[PDB]
Amino acid sequence: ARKLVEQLKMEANIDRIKVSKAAADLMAYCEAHAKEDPLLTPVPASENPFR
Amino acid sequence: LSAEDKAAVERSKMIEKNLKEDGISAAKDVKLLLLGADNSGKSTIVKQMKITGIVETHFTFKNLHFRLFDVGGQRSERKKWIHCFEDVTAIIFCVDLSDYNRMHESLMLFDSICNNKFFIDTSIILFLNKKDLFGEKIKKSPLTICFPEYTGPNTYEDAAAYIQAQFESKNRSPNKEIYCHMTCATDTNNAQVIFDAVTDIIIANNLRGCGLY
Amino acid sequence: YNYYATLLTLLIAVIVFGNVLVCMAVSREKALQTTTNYLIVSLAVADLLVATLVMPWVVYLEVVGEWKFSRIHCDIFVTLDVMMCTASILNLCAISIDRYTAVAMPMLYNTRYSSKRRVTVMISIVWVLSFTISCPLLFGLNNADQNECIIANPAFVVYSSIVSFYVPFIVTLLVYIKIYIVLRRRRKRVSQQKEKKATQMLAIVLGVFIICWLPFFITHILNIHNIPPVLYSAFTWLGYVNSAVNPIIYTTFNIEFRKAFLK
Amino acid sequence: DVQLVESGGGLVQPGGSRKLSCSASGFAFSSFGMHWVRQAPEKGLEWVAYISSGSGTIYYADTVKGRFTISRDDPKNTLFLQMTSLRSEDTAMYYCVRSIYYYGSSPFDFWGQGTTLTVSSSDIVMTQATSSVPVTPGESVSISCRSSKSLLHSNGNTYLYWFLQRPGQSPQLLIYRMSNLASGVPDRFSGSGSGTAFTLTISRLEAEDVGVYYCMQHLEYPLTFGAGTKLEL
Amino acid sequence: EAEQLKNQIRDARKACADATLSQITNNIDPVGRIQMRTRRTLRGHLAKIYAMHWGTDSRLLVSASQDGKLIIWDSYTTNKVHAIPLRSSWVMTCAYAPSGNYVACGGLDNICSIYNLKTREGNVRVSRELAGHTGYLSCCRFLDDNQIVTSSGDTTCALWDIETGQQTTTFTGHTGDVMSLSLAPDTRLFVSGACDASAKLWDVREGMCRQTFTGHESDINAICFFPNGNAFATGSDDATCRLFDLRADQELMTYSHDNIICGITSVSFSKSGRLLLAGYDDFNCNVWDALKADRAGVLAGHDNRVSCLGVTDDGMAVATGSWDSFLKIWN
Ligand SMILES: CCN(CC)C(=O)[C@@H]1C=C2c3cccc4[nH]cc(c34)C[C@H]2N(C)C1
After folding, report:
1. SS3 track for chain B
2. Which parts of this chain are annotated as the region G3 motif (chain B)?
């Protein structure tokens, strides 16, 4: 029980950002790498090794 | 091709032939799942046992190779890996009749595997072990297990037949048979019972595929 | 006579509908793709070819009453008739042998690698043997007149009737009663409605095969060693009706086939 | 350790026959394709024959077709070369070479010490322009090789191989497919090229880098070597 | 005191929930119809396929099946490069080292065994047999040639030293069977889902759990990190996938549909992280738009359940293994 209490205390004292900030960073990462995602934007058949 | 690609394709073809040969060799095995409570005669269920994660014994009987897998010993969430044995020909479920407090744990465990989604259509070879010790024990403690329901004679062949009916009451589906056998650890021939039940199960599946069933 | 056109066209449509549904069912459902079902597909292909190639000219013979096309055309017609009917009968014998393998060789039947080779060999043998039985008619062995398209060779009639019907018939009969005896043996050795169901199916397939094809061939043997012609025509049409009833009796009882037909 | 020990030869009369052997040890012999390569006295390497893993594919050089026979005994871990109608041109040191072919593999990665045969009396051309290059220890060197046909295949591979034959030793693979360093080779050796022009670069020469350097193509059979360039200190 | 600390964490998480990811992602264009097709079909496995892993070159991939075989495939040509027979046929996981020199696999034998692909001999050999787990091996993943994390059904994860062959660290705190494992891009942290319906972020060097994540109603079968390393996705038996953020320390997005009533076997992200791909028990793989929680596409070319899947490092292709003994490559 003491180990569980210590673990909960260790996990409760972390620095948490707002969820809006996390969503903004996730959207920014997705937008910054969108062009380099072949499964998102299909590539031409010339550049597709599985043609 | 570049003539290194041709050699690579030749190597791939040799690998494919080896895979096919190994598959042909493995396809003639009867895979069986051993189950039951601890000290229920699981280990010494057949005399031939050639071989803490998973124990796999095997024996040959009438030119048929049997592979028995004892899953007791994992001690983990059963639902996460019981699907691995979905393709076994049958299940061997061992029960100790002389254990009157593990009788309900065995009965509850029988429900779980009989009504499993991955084993709805998988036949069960039920072994009721320790009949010799059951006859000598019933004279002292007649009604220490099935308190509410049992109101029949206290003969050896009467209560033993009643315990058998309780297990087969749990087969809530068609196309699945329970092959009940009463065994004693002194001297028995359990390979014939498994071989005969497996032949019946395979013939039933063959008729089902042909459409006669 | 335009009265035959309607009835015989509905018979052709019934045959085509049933066999096409059997083929589509086996192709579409992955659970249905097994080797026995491939033998059933071979039977369905034989029946479908009977309905599509052979029967339309038989309707022409009934309507017009005389052959107003080429003599080589008549040769193709008669050899196709013999070939496809023989293929259907030999497919029935092959299905019988496969069902025997299921009961008397349960372990070999379950093996996929051996079962594929068995069924591919059986399908090849039945189709090749039907072709080889029918091939002498292509050589002008038939003696049809200019007006009529018929088979006028008693010797070929006997020799082809024997190999095409009688020995596959005897073999299928002996095989099915052997399966019946083995089923009774295991029933004695050992819900139970399935055991009576199996007997029903064996009786149904045997009875359909006896009734549809036996009167035609026995009439041929009696003729070649008088009987009116209208019953002769009806006996031939009974053999054609065998193709109509086969996809019903060989699939509509099985449950997985019913699910595919509903879907 | 990997071992290929050849045997059989030394002196034959013209028109005679002799059988060469090559005993494999220390590796899965059935997995490798095997080659025979010969070197005449004071001459370069020349490919003779090839037998694939499983003996499904066999090739011969044009100078030996019909006369020579390559065979294989996987249980015995032995390779054979039956020669008939021997000529004066067959006097050479015959080498046994293992080759395994898959994606990313290293063909020609091990050679035997060779056996000597003495007979008592279209094809891609590999051009190695320089024949001798005096060198100093610690200086950089650049050996070059030319090819009649482009070795760049449509799959992106350039099938050029570099070998180094030190004095008295059998040749050792350095580069495979024009850029890839072989196992156990120091990082000083580098490979560059494009289609037809190829070069092997040595950064800091050592005393052990003294020997004849050969270039080989593997785009198509028959495999052809170039007259190797000697390095002398 | 445990109740007060748990309530404090719940209050702390609620304070950082000023808005939902749905609202911030309300004004971006939908990804649209994502239609992929089977470009390659890899055949040769004769039983259920339980796991696969791409090599770092995005051309080689390893697959593990119940037939006791571990096959390395050349996906471009469909050539079989290696066929490695396994001592135990009850494999449930496999791994491909980043260098390409090693593969690993394990299962109900309670051992993640290491194999050396590059030997002076032509054949592959066992390098190590990592023994010490009490339950079945559900997932192992290489950090380098000498280090490998394992997850097991004994409710623990372990970091092994491959050279010495023993556990450098033992990670404990889960109350149920651990089913899945996903290393961060930097390899300094890893996440892990288990049968207690929670996920835990662990620090590799210090040995302890930093954060614990809840929300699922059943066993978590699969877990994968977002490419940023600041978030991860889970797949569970409750027919739901969930996106978790490490810095916010709470759920962001839920991927479910009322017609989906079946468990999730595997999960993987796209290279940009915009597409969340999940394998299901209903024989198909669903492509979710990770930001908008909308279903973008389906891969419906398997006759049995999709047991595993993986996206290439270059993001050019995705693989899907299945219980029908086939692997398919989709583009
Ligand atoms: C009236 C004239 N026609 C039409 C061409 C026939 O007699 C056909 C001859 C047949 C025949 C002969 C000899 C052997 C055989 N096997 C299978 C058949 C067969 C089919 C059978 N069909 C149904 C009729």
Report:
1. CCCCHHHHHHHHHHHHHHHHHHHHHHCCEEEEEEEECCCCCCCCCCCCCCCCCCEEEEEEECCEEEEEEECCCCCCCHHHCHHHHCCCCEEEEEEECCCCCCHHHHHHHHHHHHCCCCCCCCCEEEEEECCHHHHHHHCCCCCCCCCCCCCCCCCHHHHHHHHHHHHHCCCCCCCCCEEEEECCCCCCCHHHHHHHHHHHHHHHHHHHHHCCC
2. 66-75
Ligand 1 pocket member C81 (CB < 6 A):
yes
Contact B51, D91 (CB under 8 A): no
CATH code of residue A32: 4.10.260.10
Q: Say whether D53 and B11 touch across the interface (CB within 8 A).
A: yes
Breaks (C-N over 2.5 A) in chain C follow: 190, 225
At the topology level, CATH places domain E1-331 in Methylamine Dehydrogenase; Chain H (2.130.10)
How many folded domains does chain A comprise?
Answer: 1
Dihedral Cα E15, E21, E27, E28, nearest 10 deg: 150
**3-state SS, residue D112:** coil
- Experimental approach was cryo-EM
Q: How far is CA C12 from CA C6, C16, C20, C240, in A?
A: 10, 6, 12, 9
- Residue span of the structural domain in which A46 resides: 1-51
Neighbours of D118 (CB within 10 A): 16
Q: Is C157 in the pocket of ligand 1 (CB under 6 A)?
A: yes
Per the CB < 8 Å rule, is D218 touching B7?
A: no
Backbone angles phi, psi at E31, to 5 degrees: -65, -30
Q: Which residues contact A22 (CB under 8 A, 6 or more apart)?
A: E21, E230, E231, E245, E247, E248, E252
Q: What is the rounded distance in angstroms from the CA atom of residue A22 to the CA atom of residue C69?
A: 84
The token pair that represents A36 in the structure block: 């380099």
